[PDB]
Every structure is written in structure tokens, then in C-alpha cells.
Amino acid sequence: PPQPRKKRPEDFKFGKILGEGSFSTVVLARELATSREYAIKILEKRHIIKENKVPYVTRERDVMSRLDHPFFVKLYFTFQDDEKLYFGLSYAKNGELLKYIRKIGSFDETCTRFYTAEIVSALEYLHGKGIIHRDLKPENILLNEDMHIQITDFGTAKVLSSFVGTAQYVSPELLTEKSACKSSDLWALGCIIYQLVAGLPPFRAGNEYLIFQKIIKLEYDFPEKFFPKARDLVEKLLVLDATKRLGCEEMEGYGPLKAHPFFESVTWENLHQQTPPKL
Ligand SMILES: Nc1nccc(-c2ccc3c(N)n[nH]c3c2)n1
Numbered sequence: 001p002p003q004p005r006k007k008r009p010e011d012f013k014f015g016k017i018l019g020e021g022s023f024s025t026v027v028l029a030r031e032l033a034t035s036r037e038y039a040i041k042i043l044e045k046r047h048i049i050k051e052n053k054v055p056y057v058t059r060e061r062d063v064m065s066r067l068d069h070p071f072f073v074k075l076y077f078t079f080q081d082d083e084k085l086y087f088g089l090s091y092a093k094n095g096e097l098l099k100y101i102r103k104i105g106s107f108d109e110t111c112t113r114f115y116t117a118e119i120v121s122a123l124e125y126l127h128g129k130g131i132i133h134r135d136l137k138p139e140n141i142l143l144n145e146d147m148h149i150q151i152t153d154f155g156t157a158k159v160l161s162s163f164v165g166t167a168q169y170v171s172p173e174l175l176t177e178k179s180a181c182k183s184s185d186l187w188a189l190g191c192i193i194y195q196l197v198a199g200l201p202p203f204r205a206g207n208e209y210l211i212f213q214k215i216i217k218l219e220y221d222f223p224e225k226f227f228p229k230a231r232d233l234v235e236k237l238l239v240l241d242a243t244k245r246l247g248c249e250e251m252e253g254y255g256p257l258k259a260h261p262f263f264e265s266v267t268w269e270n271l272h273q274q275t276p277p278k279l
Contacts (some may be wrong), residue, residue, distance in 0.1 A: 004077075006077075006079045007083070007088070009079075009086070010275065012038075012040070014027050014028070014032045015027065015029060015030065018039050021270060023043060023044075023047060023053055023056075024042065025041070026040065026041045026089070027039075027040050027042060028040075028091065029088075035279050037091045037093075038084055038088045038091055038208070039088075039090065039092070040087065040089065041086070042087075043085040043086075043087075044083060044084055044087055045080070045084060045085060048225040052097075053155075056155040056156065059157055059159070060153075060155040060157070061075065063131060063154040063159065064087075064154050064257075066131070067126070067129070067131075067154075069122070069125045070150075070272040071118055071119075071121060071124075071125070071148070071149050071272065072126070072150060072151050072152070073092065073142065073150045073152035074156060076088040079221070091102055091150070092142035092143055092153075093144060094143035094144065094147060095143065096138060096141070097142070097143060097149065098137075098139045098141075101138055101199065104198045105277060106199035106216065107196045108186055109181075111276075111277045111279060112196045112227065112230060113263065113265070114266075114276060116189075116192075116196065116262075116263075117268070117271055118245040118265045118272075119141065119151075119189060119265075120247075120258065121268060122149065123136075123269055124258075126185075127254075130159060130160035131157055132157060132160065132181065133151070133154070133156070133185050133188075134156045134157060134158055134165055134184060135156045135166060135169070136169065136185055136189065137168075137191075138195060139166075147276040148271075148276060158180060160182075162178075167208045167211045167212065168211060169201070170186075170215060171183070171242065172187075172218075173242045176216060181242060182248060182249070183243070183247075186245045187242070189237055189247075190234050190245075192234060193230060193237070194220075194222075194234050194238070197227060198222070202220035203215050203220050217239075218238065229260075230262050232261070233262045
């Protein structure tokens with residue numbers, strides 16, 4: 001069927017910068033014809049080509065097109081001009097989950113449970129499509145106006161059937177094997193839960209090399225103020241042997257993960273319809 005004509009830069013009033021990476025900048029934009037706000041990710045073609053990033057840009061576009069779920073930033077449109085590529089993305093007005101962790105220090109058990117459940121539910125959907133994020137972290141987990149999560153940044157994703165993420169969230173197998181799987185995301189999940197509860201990521205040190213040392217030695221520990229059921233859950237995710245992490249295929253998938261006692265009170269079927277606990 002006839003899709004709308006390609007959009008163009010002149011269709012938008014660009015505004016503030018929402019994020020910037022080494023190969024991209026995200027800018028808030030208001031579409032003139034609709035008054036709709038989008039987060040437009042802008043990439044310089046010459047820079048992408050010069051640095052051999054075409055496969056990453058291509059993978060991000062192809063992945064974000066296949067995703068159709070409330071807990072993921074949506075790709076609405078793409079266009080280009082002579083110098084740049086533009087991706088129209090969902091605007092998550094409340095920014096990064098990381099910001100909330102810093103602002104309030106640590107989450108109480110109700111908020112930890114609710115947001116962990118959304119991430120688990122998001123991962124179940126992503127993994128059921130044979131997609132692996134490979135760089136999951138609080139910086140990539142955005143909050144919409146409604147305070148529900150929206151996971152973004154899929155340039156580094158792998159579609160099942162090479163790259164190393166953000167040091168604090170790298171799984172051991174990436175350091176010893178150079179190979180990633182769904183279980184690498186579950187490892188990151190373990191780190192994120194721990195971070196929501198402790199206020200800090202589990203593996204910390206003065207530099208990348210020392211963080212990696214700690215990861216492969218499973219060198220971290222829990223604070224006394226750690227919800228016992230959350231602790232048990234984290235211990236079942238932060239496991240060196242990737243095939244023994246709660247949630248992976250060899251452990252029989254998402255059922256047993258979702259049935260963990262930490263999630264006892266969670267109703268999984270309609271999280272996105274529930275009202276997030278106030279932060
Ligand atoms: N795919 C991708 N890559 C890099 C950054 C982003 C991104 C960053 C910030 C926002 C926001 N406030 N709303 N939407 C965003 C999307 N998205």
C-alpha cells in the first residue's frame with residue numbers, strides 16, 4: 001500500500017540535543033504538520049563509511065523495523081539528505097533510567113520489582129525474535145512520559161542464525177570467547193537489577209582492565225541492605241557459565257525466570273497497562 005512520501009529536514013523544527021555518541025547525535029524535533037515530537041538520530045554518512053560502521057547502521061535500522069512492542073523505542077521513518085541519515089524515533093520525554101538511579105540513589109523493592117519486570121518482559125519479546133541487544137544498560141533504558149520503559153540503541157544488536165559493550169556490563173564469555181548469545185543480555189540484566197538495588201553496578205574499578213579482571217573472577221558482593229529475594233535472583237543471573245543463567249534456553253527459558261519469588265506479586269500479561277510505582 002502507498003506509504004507517506006519521504007519526510008525531509010524542512011518538515012521539522014529541530015530543537016535541543018538529546019544524546020550524542022561517536023557516530024551519531026540525537027536531536028529533539030517537532031514535525032510542523034502534526035505538532036508531533038520525535039527524537040531524530042542523525043548520522044553523518046562520510047563518518048560512517050570512513051569508520052566502517054555501515055553494517056552497524058544497517059543492523060540498527062533492520063532491527064528497529066522488526067520490533068513492535070511498547071517497551072522498545074520505535075523507528076517511525078528514515079530519510080537522508082546529501083550528508084546525513086535521519087532516523088525518526090520515539091521521544092522518551094523522561095530520559096535515561098540512569099538519571100533516576102542517580103537522582104534517588106537506589107530503588108525501594110516495589111520500584112525495583114516493577115521496572116525489573118518490564119525489562120524481563122522486554123527481553124522475553126526481543127529474545128523470542130532471535131535478537132540480542134548486546135549492550136543493555138541503564139543509559140539505553142529510557143523512560144517515556146508515562147514512566148514505562150522504552151529500550152533503545154540497536155546498532156550493536158545481533159540477529160541470531162565481534163563488538164564489546166560497556167565495560168561494567170560485559171559478560172564473562174565476551175572476555176574469554178569473543179562470542180555473545182541471549183545469555184549475555186541476562187548477565188547485563190543481573191548487573192542492572194543489582195544497580196537498581198545497590199545504587200551502583202556490581203563490578204567497579206579504576207579502569208577497564210581491572211573491571212574485566214573482576215568480571216571473569218566473579219569478584220563482587222552484596223551490601224547488607226539488599227532485598228533477599230533480589231539477591232537470590234541476581235546470584236542466578238550473574239553466573240560465569242552462560243548456560244546456567246536463569247532465563248536462558250538450557251535453564252528452560254523465561255517461565256522459570258518470571259516465576260522467581262522476587263516477582264511473586266507481578267502480573268506479567270499487562271505490565272504496560274499498569275500504573276508505575278512513583279519514584
Ligand atoms: N537508537 C538510539 N540510539 C541512540 C540514542 C537514542 C535515543 C536517545 C535519547 C532519546 C530520547 N530522549 N528519546 N528517544 C531517544 C533515543 N536512540
